[PDB]
Structure formats: C-alpha cells, structure tokens
Design a protein around this ligand. Structure first.
Ligand SMILES: [Cl-]
Lengths: 65, 68
C-alpha cells in the first residue's frame, strides 16, 4: 500500500520528509521494500527515490502524504 | 517472462552477457521494465542488477548480468 511515485508525479507534490540509509539488498524489489518500510514508519503514503549510490548501496527517498 | 533474480539465486548461476545503459529513472518499476526489455532483446530469461548510480535525481546508470 506504500508505493513509489514516478518523477513526473512526485514533481507536482511537496514532500514532508525524506529517508536516507545504507545496506546490502538482494534486488530492486528488496530496495523498494526497505524504502517502503521506512516510509510507512514515518506515516508516508508514497515515496520517490532520489539518490542511489554504490559503496552495499546508499538510498535517499522523499516522503509524501 | 523475464524475471529479476536476487543475490543468492544469481550467485549460483553463470551469466552469458550483461546490459549497461543510462536513462530516465522514473521509479523502480519503470527502470526494471527497461532492464527486462533489454534482457529480453538479448535472449535472457533472468537478470541480476550488478551496479546502479542515480546521483542527480533524473537519470540512472545501470548494469545487469543476463542469464538463460
Ligand atoms: Cl538474496
């Protein structure tokens, strides 16, 4: 129920917070799950991932009501 | 159809090729679709993402190993 917006949708909206974290994830479904979990913890209904870095991976996503 | 593998599954398999490209991210669903399409064009049944860089929140550079 906590879903990722595409950039065109997110661009029209105002985020209330963001999440930023690092970890070792099996695939893109797992990355999305990890973001969604942190998003849901913060009361977001949606998110949009804004950064993905190599180093494990580091991910940053904006959160939306 | 073409399926994404997780790390442990891919680790036991041997890829035959990879895809590497840069394009519009959109969201994970949309980028996964782009990877799957390129995998399908090369004859793969599975892929595993090996690298990803999204550093300025527009484009993403990705690579993926391909498997039969
Ligand atoms: Cl795994």
């Amino acid at each position: 129920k906590v879903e990722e917006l595409n950039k065109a949708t997110a661009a029209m909206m105002v985020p209330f917070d963001s999440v930023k974290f690092t970890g070792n994830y099996g695939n893109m479904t797992e990355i999305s799950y990890q973001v969604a979990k942190r998003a849901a913890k913060k009361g977001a209904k949606y998110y949009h991932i804004t950064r993905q870095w190599q180093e494990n991976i580091t991910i940053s996503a904006d959160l939306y009501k």
